[PDB]
Amino acid sequence: ANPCCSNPCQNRGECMSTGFDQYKCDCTRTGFYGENCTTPEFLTRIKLLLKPTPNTVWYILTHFKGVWNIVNNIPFLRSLIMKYVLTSRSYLIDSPPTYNVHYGYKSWEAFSNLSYYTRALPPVADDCPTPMGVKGNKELPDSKEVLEKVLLRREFIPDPQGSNMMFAFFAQHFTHQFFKTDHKRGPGFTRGLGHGVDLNHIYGETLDRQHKLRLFKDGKLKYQVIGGEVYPPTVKDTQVEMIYPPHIPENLQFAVGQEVFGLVPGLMMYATIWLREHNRVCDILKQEHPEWGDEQLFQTSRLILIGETIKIVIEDYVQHLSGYHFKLKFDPELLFNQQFQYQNRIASEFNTLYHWHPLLPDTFNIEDQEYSFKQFLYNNSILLEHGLTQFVESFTRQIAGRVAGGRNVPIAVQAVAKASIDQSREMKYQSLNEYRKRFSLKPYTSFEELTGEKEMAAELKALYSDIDVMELYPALLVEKPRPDAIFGETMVELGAPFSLKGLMGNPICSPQYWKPSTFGGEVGFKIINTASIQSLICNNVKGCPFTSFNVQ
Amino acid sequence: ANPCCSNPCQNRGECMSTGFDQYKCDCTRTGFYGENCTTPEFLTRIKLLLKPTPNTVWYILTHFKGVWNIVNNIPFLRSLIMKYVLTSRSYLIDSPPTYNVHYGYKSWEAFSNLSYYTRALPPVADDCPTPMGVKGNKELPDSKEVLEKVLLRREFIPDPQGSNMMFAFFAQHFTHQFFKTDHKRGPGFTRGLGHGVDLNHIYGETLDRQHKLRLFKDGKLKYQVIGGEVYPPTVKDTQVEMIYPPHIPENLQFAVGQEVFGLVPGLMMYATIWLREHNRVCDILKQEHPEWGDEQLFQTSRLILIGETIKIVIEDYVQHLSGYHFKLKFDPELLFNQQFQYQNRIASEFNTLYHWHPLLPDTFNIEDQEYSFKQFLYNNSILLEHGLTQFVESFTRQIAGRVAGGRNVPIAVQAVAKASIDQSREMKYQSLNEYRKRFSLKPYTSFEELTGEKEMAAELKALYSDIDVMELYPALLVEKPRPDAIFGETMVELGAPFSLKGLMGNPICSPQYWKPSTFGGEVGFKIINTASIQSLICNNVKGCPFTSFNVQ
Ligand SMILES: *[C@@H]1O[C@H](CO)[C@@H](O[C@@H]2O[C@H](CO)[C@@H](O)[C@H](O)[C@H]2NC(C)=O)[C@H](O)[C@H]1NC(C)=O
Ligand SMILES: *[C@@H]1O[C@H](CO)[C@@H](O[C@@H]2O[C@H](CO)[C@@H](O)[C@H](O)[C@H]2NC(C)=O)[C@H](O)[C@H]1NC(C)=O
Ligand SMILES: Cc1ccc(Nc2c(F)cccc2Cl)c(CC(=O)O)c1
Ligand SMILES: Cc1ccc(Nc2c(F)cccc2Cl)c(CC(=O)O)c1
Ligand SMILES: *[C@@H]1O[C@H](CO)[C@@H](O)[C@H](O)[C@H]1NC(C)=O
Ligand SMILES: *[C@@H]1O[C@H](CO)[C@@H](O)[C@H](O)[C@H]1NC(C)=O
Ligand SMILES: *[C@@H]1O[C@H](CO)[C@@H](O)[C@H](O)[C@H]1NC(C)=O
Ligand SMILES: *[C@@H]1O[C@H](CO)[C@@H](O)[C@H](O)[C@H]1NC(C)=O
């Protein structure tokens, strides 16, 4: 019924109904005009020829390594390029946010209600004839069939980029502070009202939860010592609610910021490391400020660990998966002379892109042991058995699975991979090509172009019939990977804008926050600016084991 | 004890303790250096000579009326000047926000907790020897003595700018959507979690309250017809909670967005006007969009009334009290090529500046009646008796009191004016001169310089002894007024940055929102851009009575 169901407006134009069977496109500041905003203005036509393809920019950044060696050592030039990286990506994000799962039009409810994930593209109207709008059949192909044919893992396909389990669990740990779906309300809702990197997975979402976790001495968080090693406190000691099976002994019920981090020892490993990092920073700040109280020591340490997290994510984590030879740089000053909104709203699609199920291995290999999913889940006894040192060394060695390329989703999490499909449909997501156009990508003309091969493409064509009906999430996992890369084009070109906007949109990156006094002086400021995944492990894990996000 | 108690850092430098009796100033991006950030850099020294005094800029804007007549009709030039107005003011505001009543240092608690008013200046630390830091005596002068000597009204002093009661009640009505002190928590807390112009005083703060107020037909709000006139619904009919004395008849207990607007008929008058405006806009939008449902009609009308509100505040309301001959302009496009944060956090100080107690008259003169405070309070029967038309005509005629100049606080509200003083001390406000310096003003060197006279100045000197101890709030009401103006310099130079930042910081002023489709097309967009305090009254009040923010 809705005349906008066909998504007629192009180039980020906005569609509005002007009757029961008529519409109008708002071409304001899109650079285009005409009925569907497809006729480019003069300046627009120029940029279309100048601006390079994303597979060209990716090529430049991931090749000419000898040239980048020169550029990386020229601070002026390095800053110039990183500046362009930050600005060009964040331009794709609406800020302040617009739509959510319940509003395909702008409204104060959509803006003000922080319980929603926001949406980069509006939901398909409920009164639309087809799930994608007007194209396709009355119902999308069976999600179980999509899963089994092109998603489920036959043989384990390792990541050619060499991403290890330190990378895998970091991603899971890091993103679970702003991906906290409120399953009581629905998949389009979140419990992470900070909508960013606030480290609530360490300190707790609520003030009540934070105080139960705090020692209230020297700004530190509560902890316990087991075998001479520092571990998180227990549920019994702090009364913070955690998610554990009833058969789990209460001395193994560790209490941390995020309630689900008891799920896997890999998450509990990072929770422990970050816990130690907080208290380490407390000691350092106390050395500098003996006149400071517990409260200021805590708050300043939290701001410092936020800085470290963003530092590490940009210069280690993102640096790895991007495959760039350009040396990425966390420098908030790069945006001080730029137009930039220091705010963020977590997008539903960003959460969907981050469903990296194929990343998981078939077994979790710690030391000489090889644990199954059943043995690994909710089993912190494994962590106490081997220790953090053995955990880091083992996870540094074990490679992770390739995400793009198809058929690499471990069958142990098939219900989870199917939920992504189902829930994406439940949230009325628009098609793959709609999202590609939204982020300046050309639509795929065939399933073969999408997969880069023949077999899976044929399988998908039997299911979806039309390429313009192809869903976003399963397309990410079967997409033709970039040359020896872990991802396809869609994953990176869509995800980077959400990521960098979330990282740089943090208030500590703003000019009034980004100064030594915010972090207790130059000493605390230096902790942020010299942070790395290696130094994080070195300072907090016994023996200072070598670590990295790739296998050696 | 705290080495920062003397507020040693100048030019918005930040003070940090480096020991029990030592400090360090963070001079980052202040334009100054040295121990106290008092030594100007070269570029800074230039601007100091170039940049004009606020009492000179005010002079230019409020004089040379013949010249402004030419400028106002040159769209390029008018836009250029309004641009500078918006940018130069908003630069004084920290955005994202920093301090609150409980944090004199930056912290994630201070940033993330929206229940706090933010603070333009940090509170004086609790372990400071004197209430202002180090200067003055152990305790500030008795607030009752300050009140009775230089604040309380002897003879009614009318506003020379001709501000009427339409202005007074507009101010009270308008500001009570973001000044909603949570008295359960303390004076530094707020219930207005939107921290801006969201019109929650019309639509309710919570979703539960909004749905009780809505008709769920044609996007409209519930209403009742009394004597052929449209008035708000009752508490009994809608079950929304309002604040009323137990003796108030339930047919007179009107239910509106703000729970306190039953307090005075002046507020209920505006609540009724805006209620009618929402339903009027619903009719217009329904005419254009018969295919729209109740929800979209409601949401779009709300965004439109938000636009009208900002439009009226800038071009009628602010236009009046500013005294400018320059024609102010609400144009979000003026900031599209500028650096600006589309966000806002309501400052405690802005609330304190807005305690315009001297504005109130001695009686509320409606038609041929003259009501006392006792008769006027909680008496909506007055509103039904005379009607909206008579209210508008009467309030347009009745002049309001001068705010600056001293001794004009009506004794009927002395308990409220005393509370303003006491709560300011409770929230540990810094001195008047500290806040003047914060907003680029020179400190007052004497009480005579502050008041511009002799008698009140002597009174204050006996109470405060030192000018550097003089409090902010009572200083506003006794300050030497600008020539034939309602305010002194401090009130305007401090308030204008808070005001304009809140208005333009609204998400509908952002480039992604500021387009016709957001407001249902050009017809709705036109409503915002042609809104005025007169058109608001003309469209919604029978007879289209003349109205204005000044007496005729
Ligand atoms: C914002 O800060 C206020 C003040 O600290 C918090 O209110 C306190 O909440 C605790 C519960 O954890 C109560 O025991 C205190 O009595 C409250 N104090 C006051 C003054 O009300 C509030 O919880 C914080 N809000 C958020 C969202 O964290
Ligand atoms: C944000 O939106 C959600 C969804 O509309 C609101 O949750 C609803 O709240 C009402 C109460 O007013 C309940 O009757 C519904 O069952 C809730 N729905 C869901 C899906 O949870 C929520 O209240 C909104 N948040 C705010 C702060 O207004
Ligand atoms: C779904 C997704 C997409 C891209 C990235 N990172 C990334 C990338 F893979 C290439 C260039 C820049 C960035 Cl920020 C990430 C990881 C991250 O930035 O948090 C996730
Ligand atoms: C305490 C206070 C100070 C200044 C103003 N308005 C105002 C003014 F009085 C002069 C110049 C610009 C502006 Cl925005 C106002 C009114 C307002 O904008 O809400 C209140
Ligand atoms: C705009 O799009 C509609 C539907 O997508 C199409 O039928 C029409 O031809 C288009 N108009 C143009 C391209 O001018
Ligand atoms: C948990 O891990 C330990 C190894 O430390 C193993 O012995 C035990 O069987 C595991 N528990 C389950 C339920 O698999
Ligand atoms: C800085 O301020 C302190 C206290 O206000 C003062 O004692 C000191 O002399 C100042 N230092 C300067 C102005 O260099
Ligand atoms: C309320 O106003 C009416 C006039 O409409 C007046 O007669 C009455 O006395 C007032 N009520 C009180 C309690 O003063």
| Strand A369-371, strand A364-366: pairing | antiparallel
Rounded to 5 degrees, φ, ψ at A113 are -80, 105
Look up residue B198 and give its two tokens. 């969201």
Strand-pair partners of A234: A254
Q: Which of B323, B279, B339 is nearest to B162 (CA)?
A: B323
Say which amino acid occupies A165: M
Expressed in angstroms and rounded, the spacing between residue B481 Cα and the centre of ligand 4 is: 15
A18–B194: do the CB atoms touch at under 8 Å?
Answer: no
Chain B CB within 8 Å of residue A512 CB: yes
**SS3 per-residue string spanning A62-106:** HCCHHHHHHHCCCHHHHHHHHHHHHHHHHCCCCCCCCEECCECCC
Q: Whose CA is nearest to atom 19 of ligand 1?
A: B185
DSSP string, B469-534: G--HHHHHHHSPPPTT-SS-HHHHHHHHHHHHHHHHTSGGGSTTT-SGGGGTSHHHHHHHHT--HH
Say which amino acid occupies A534: Q
Look up residue A422 and give its two tokens. 């189902």
Same fold, A1-41 and A42-552: no
Q: Which of A364, A380, A382, A391 to mutate to test the pocket of ligand 6 (most atoms within 8 A of CB)?
A: A382
Smallest Cβ–Cβ distance between B194 and the set A107, A112, A341 belongs to A112
Rg (Cα) of chain B, in Å, rounded?
Answer: 24
Pocket of ligand 1 contains residue A208 by CB under 6 Å: yes
Round to whole Å and give the CA distance between B417 and B261: 20
Round to whole Å and give the CA distance between B283 and B297: 9
Chain A CB within 8 Å of residue B96 CB: yes
B521–A18: do the CB atoms touch at under 8 Å?
Answer: yes
Task: Give, in order, the Cα–Cα distances in Å from A352 to each of A181, A244, A471, A477, B69.
Answer: 11, 26, 11, 11, 57
Round to whole Å and give the CA distance between B512 and A447: 34
Task: Give, in order, the Cα–Cα distances in Å from B251 to each of A154, B228, B243, B247, B248.
Answer: 73, 16, 14, 12, 8
Q: Whose CA is nearest to atom 3 of ligand 7?
A: B8
Per the CB < 8 A criterion, the answer to whether B181 and B455 are in contact is no
Angle A327-A329-A334 from CA coordinates, rounded to 5°: 135
Helix (H) or strand (E) holding B212: helix B207-213
Chain A CB within 8 Å of residue B20 CB: yes
Instruction: Tell me which DSSP letter residue B148 carries.
Output: I
Neighbour-count burial for B453-491, b at 16+ CB within 10 Å, e otherwise: eeebbebbeebbeebbbbbbbbbbbbbbbbeebbbbbbb
A288–B98: do the CB atoms touch at under 8 Å?
Answer: no
Round to whole Å and give the CA distance between A124 and A131: 7
Round to whole Å and give the CA distance between B390 and B367: 7
Instruction: Tell me which DSSP letter residue B232 carries.
Output: P
Roughly how many angstroms between the first and final C-alpha of chain A, as a whole number?
57
Q: Which of B381, B384, B391 to mutate to test the pocket of ligand 8 (most atoms within 8 A of CB)?
A: B381
Roughly how many angstroms between the first and final C-alpha of chain B, as a whole number?
57
Q: Which of A61, A65, A158, A169 is nearest to A547 (CA)?
A: A169
Round to whole Å and give the CA distance between A294 and A301: 11
Tokens 């060209």 sit on residue: A56
A357 annotated as a binding-site residue: yes
Ligand 3: residues with CB < 6 A are A 318, 321-322, 353-354, 491-492, 495-496, 499-500
| Strand B229-231, strand B224-226: pairing | antiparallel
Round to whole Å and give the CA distance between A229 and A269: 12
Q: Which of A251, A380, A381 to mutate to test the pocket of ligand 6 (most atoms within 8 A of CB)?
A: A381
Round to whole Å and give the CA distance between A337 and B277: 42
Per the CB < 8 A criterion, the answer to whether A101 and A427 are in contact is yes
Round to whole Å and give the CA distance between B396 and B269: 13
Q: Does domain A42-552 have CATH number 1.10.640.10?
A: yes
Q: Which ligand is nearest to the CA of B33?
A: 7
CATH architecture assigned to A1-41 = Ribbon (2.10)
| Strand B23-26, strand B32-33: pairing | unpaired
- Contacting residues of A for B521, CB less than 8 Å apart: 16, 18, 24
Round to whole Å and give the CA distance between A472 and A113: 26
Look up residue B421 and give its two tokens. 């003083």
Per the CB < 8 A criterion, the answer to whether B493 and B355 are in contact is no
Rounded to 5 degrees, φ, ψ at B48 are -60, -35
Looking from the CA of residue B384, the nearest atom of ligand 8 is 5
Round to whole Å and give the CA distance between B215 and B525: 24
Round to whole Å and give the CA distance between B169 and B263: 12
Round to whole Å and give the CA distance between B52 and B535: 37
A23 annotated as a binding-site residue: no
Interface A–B counts its CB contacts (< 8 A) at: 135
Identify the experimental approach. X-ray
Per the CB < 8 A criterion, the answer to whether A2 and A17 are in contact is yes
Helix (H) or strand (E) holding B226: strand B224-226
Strand-pair partners of A399: A164
Round to whole Å and give the CA distance between A387 and A227: 10
A517–B207: do the CB atoms touch at under 8 Å?
Answer: no
Per the CB < 8 A criterion, the answer to whether B374 and B410 are in contact is no
Round to whole Å and give the CA distance between B26 and B30: 9
| Strand A369-371, strand B118-119: pairing | unpaired
Round to whole Å and give the CA distance between B283 and B277: 10
Look up residue B263 and give its two tokens. 């307090």
DSSP string, A314-377: IIIIHHHHH--SS-----GGGGTTS---S----BHHHHHHT--GGGS-SSEEETTEEE-HHHHT
Instruction: Tell me which DSSP letter residue B120 carries.
Output: S
Per the CB < 8 A criterion, the answer to whether B542 and B279 are in contact is no
Round to whole Å and give the CA distance between A47 and A25: 22
Residues 6+ apart with CB under 8 A from A444: A432, A433, A436, A450, A467, A470
**What residues does each domain of chain A span?**
1-41, 42-552
Say which amino acid occupies B490: T
Beta-carbon neighbour count of residue B182 at 10 Å? Answer: 15
Task: Give, in order, the Cα–Cα distances in Å from A27 to each of A10, B200, B526.
Answer: 9, 31, 17
Tokens 């490391």 sit on residue: A273
Q: Whose CA is nearest to atom 1 of ligand 4?
A: B495
Per the CB < 8 A criterion, the answer to whether B432 and B490 are in contact is yes
Round to whole Å and give the CA distance between A326 and A70: 10
| B187 CB-contact burial (10 Å; exposed 0-12 / middle 13-18 / buried 19+) | buried
Round to whole Å and give the CA distance between B491 and B425: 18
Helix (H, G, I), strand (E, B) or coil at A112: helix
A515–B14: do the CB atoms touch at under 8 Å?
Answer: yes
Tokens 């979806």 sit on residue: A464
Round to whole Å and give the CA distance between A330 and A509: 10
Per DSSP (E only), the strands in B61-123 are 99-100, 118-119
Strand-pair partners of A8: none
